[PDB]
Structures are given as C-alpha cells and as structure tokens.
Amino acid sequence: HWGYGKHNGPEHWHKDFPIAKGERQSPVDIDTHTAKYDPSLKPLSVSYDQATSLRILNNGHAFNVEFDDSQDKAVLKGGPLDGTYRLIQFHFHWGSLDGQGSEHTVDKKKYAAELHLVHWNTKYGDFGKAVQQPDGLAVLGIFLKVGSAKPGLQKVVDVLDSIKTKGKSADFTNFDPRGLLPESLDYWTYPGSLTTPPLLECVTWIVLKEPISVSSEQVLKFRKLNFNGEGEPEELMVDNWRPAQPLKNRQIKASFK
Numbered sequence: 001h002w003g004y005g006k007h008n009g010p011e012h013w014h015k016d017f018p019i020a021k022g023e024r025q026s027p028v029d030i031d032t033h034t035a036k037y038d039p040s041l042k043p044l045s046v047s048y049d050q051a052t053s054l055r056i057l058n059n060g061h062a063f064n065v066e067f068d069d070s071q072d073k074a075v076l077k078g079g080p081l082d083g084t085y086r087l088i089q090f091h092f093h094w095g096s097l098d099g100q101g102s103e104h105t106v107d108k109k110k111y112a113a114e115l116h117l118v119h120w121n122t123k124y125g126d127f128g129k130a131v132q133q134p135d136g137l138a139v140l141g142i143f144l145k146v147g148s149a150k151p152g153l154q155k156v157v158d159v160l161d162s163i164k165t166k167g168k169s170a171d172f173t174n175f176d177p178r179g180l181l182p183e184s185l186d187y188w189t190y191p192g193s194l195t196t197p198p199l200l201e202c203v204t205w206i207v208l209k210e211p212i213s214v215s216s217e218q219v220l221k222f223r224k225l226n227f228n229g230e231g232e233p234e235e236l237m238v239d240n241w242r243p244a245q246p247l248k249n250r251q252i253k254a255s256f257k
C-alpha cells in the first residue's frame with residue numbers, strides 16, 4: 001500500500017495512480033513574483049460559527065478531525081468559488097525537522113507543517129460524488145512555522161496520546177476551527193488535486209499568505225504519532241508530505257498585491 005517511505009513514497013505512486021503525472025497535480029511551488037493579482041477575486045467568506053466537530057482519527061497517513069457535514073454548518077464561500085462548500089475534515093502534514101514539512105512552498109521555502117481544511121461543493125450531494133468533479137473540493141491551506149504556541153491548537157495536541165496508532169479514534173466534539181486561522185485571509189489560488197492517492201484532480205486550492213505560529217512542544221507532539229497500528233513495529237509519523245509538482249499549464253492568482 002502507498003505511503004511515505006523509501007519503497008512506497010511519492011516517487012512510486014504513479015504505478016498505481018497514473019494521474020500522479022497529470023496536468024493539474026498538487027502541491028506546487030508558489031512563485032510570488034509570477035503569481036498575478038486578480039482584482040476580480042472576491043473576499044473569502046469563512047463561516048465556521050456553527051461548526052460541529054465529531055471525532056479525531058489516526059488513519060495511518062495523518063490524523064483527521066471530522067465534522068458534521070449533513071447540513072450547512074461550517075462553510076467556505078466567495079473568493080474564487082461559485083456556490084457553497086461544506087467543511088468535512090481538517091488534517092496536517094509535517095516534518096521530522098522544523099525546516100521541512102509543508103506540501104506547498106513559497107519561493108521554494110518549506111514550512112514546518114501545513115494545515116488542510118477540506119470542503120466539498122454541496123451541489124454534488126456528498127463527498128464521494130464531489131471528488132469526481134473538477135470543481136468538487138475546496139481545500140484551505142495554512143502554513144505553520146515554529147515559534148510562539150497557537151492556543152487554538154492545544155486541544156488537538158492534547159488528544160494525540162489517545163490516537164497514537166493507525167485506526168485509533170476518539171471523541172472530539174465542541175472544537176472551534178476558527179482558533180487555527182491567521183489574522184489575514186489574503187490568499188493565492190490555483191486548480192489542483194488531492195495531494196495523496198487517489199490524487200484526483202478535483203480541488204480548488206486556496207493557500208493563505210500569512211502562516212500561523214506553533215510552539216516547538218506542539219510540533220514535537222505531532223512527531224510522536226505512529227504510521228503503524230498497535231502491536232506492529234513502531235514507525236514515527238513524520239514527513240507525511242508530497243513534494244512540489246510541475247505547474248504545467250496553470251497560473252497562480254493572488255487576492256492581494
């Protein structure tokens with residue numbers, strides 16, 4: 001099965017998922033001088049006040065905080081998007097060292113980790129239909145740098161002990177994802193894909209310019225998670241990121257100058 005090791009990592013994925021070499025793969029490097037300011041872009045509308053978190057799961061590749069997406073409770077609208085996109089889950093990708101871990105890069109700079117808030121287009125009825133559509137998903141990406149602690153992240157950090165290994169889950173209600181956002185909603189946007197198998201080309205990427213800061217202690221606790229299941233040889237869950245892919249026939253647009 002696919003993973004992030006020497007023998008099953010990103011350089012191998014194309015053999016089972018040929019779209020890995022496709023025309024709109026993610027992540028990409030964001031070249032800040034060649035992204036174009038687009039004044040037609042509308043401001044992002046992040047409406048998370050009625051968010052209903054349910055559960056946190058270690059799925060063997062990252063951990064997901066899952067939300068009730070059976071009504072319009074936590075939605076993303078505006079920006080490049082047409083329609084309403086519902087929040088279904090968020091997760092992170094991170095490194096073994098503070099100098100790496102993000103999937104997107106900015107002028108080839110790597111951040112310590114990257115947060116993905118995953119949303120799907122309600123006109124397609126459910127998430128499984130949406131991933132089959134070129135405008136099915138909107139993923140809001142937020143860079144993490146190491147510095148001061150992020151208070152809104154600590155509730156996540158404190159439950160990781162209970163989901164150390166693949167397949168473990170825990171109740172995770174009443175979490176407010178607004179605590180994970182930076183001050184500014186300035187962003188870059190481009191059409192891309194899921195960054196793990198099945199690598200489907202269904203995502204409008206919205207990557208915020210402003211990183212959030214997290215503490216050394218917070219990211220260290222990410223790195224104590226396990227890729228393996230309970231009773232299997234311990235392999236630390238680190239460096240679960242795909243590197244930058246060719247931009248091909250795409251232009252990255254900026255909401256700001």
Ligand SMILES: Nc1ncnc2c1ncn2CC(=O)NCCc1ccc(S(N)(=O)=O)cc1
Nearest residue numbers: 116118127128129131139193194195196198
């Ligand atoms: N009908 C279908 N066919 C095939 N698979 C289906 C499916 N229904 C569900 N699934 C699983 C799937 O696709 N899950 C995608 C999970 C995911 C990966 C990466 C990101 S990320 N890193 O891009 O944010 C965000 C989300």
Ligand SMILES: [Zn+2]
Nearest residue numbers: 091093116195
């Ligand atoms: Zn992701």
